[PDB]
């Protein structure tokens, strides 16, 4: 499960735990990816470091899969790749559009 081998794939622990556990850590761009009850797409739990007083902003995204290489997995309407990790890498290696993009792999 290449995903489970990354520094962000959290077991069956829903993003709530990933978020709860991850958000508690407060890792700038801290992310993780777990398999949703609907074992079809991978859910990535990410935490963004916010300056505001309200505290940092952490968010998760369910990786959307497709039937076109590499546009297979995507957690955005254009970010589709045959590799969540790559896409994970893309979620940071490229401008991105989600909470300070993927930064730290806080695999729950």
């Amino acid at each position: 499960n290449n995903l489970e081998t990354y520094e962000w794939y959290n077991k069956s622990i829903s993003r709530d735990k990933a978020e709860k556990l991850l958000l508690d850590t407060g890792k700038e761009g801290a992310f993780m990816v777990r398999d949703s009850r609907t074992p079809g797409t991978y859910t990535v739990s990410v935490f963004t470091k916010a300056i505001i007083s309200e505290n940092p902003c952490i968010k998760h995204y369910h990786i959307k899969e497709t039937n076109d290489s590499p546009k297979r997995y995507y957690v955005a309407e254009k970010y589709v790749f045959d590799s969540i990790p790559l896409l994970i890498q893309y979620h940071q290696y490229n401008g991105g559009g989600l909470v300070t993009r993927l930064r730290y792999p806080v695999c729950g």
């Binding site: 859910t43 968010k59 995204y61 369910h62 995507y74 955005a76 309407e77 970010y79 559009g97």
Partner: peptide, 6 residues
């Protein structure tokens, strides 16, 4: 939509 609408 529910899951942090990427």
């Amino acid at each position: 939509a529910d899951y942090e609408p990427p």
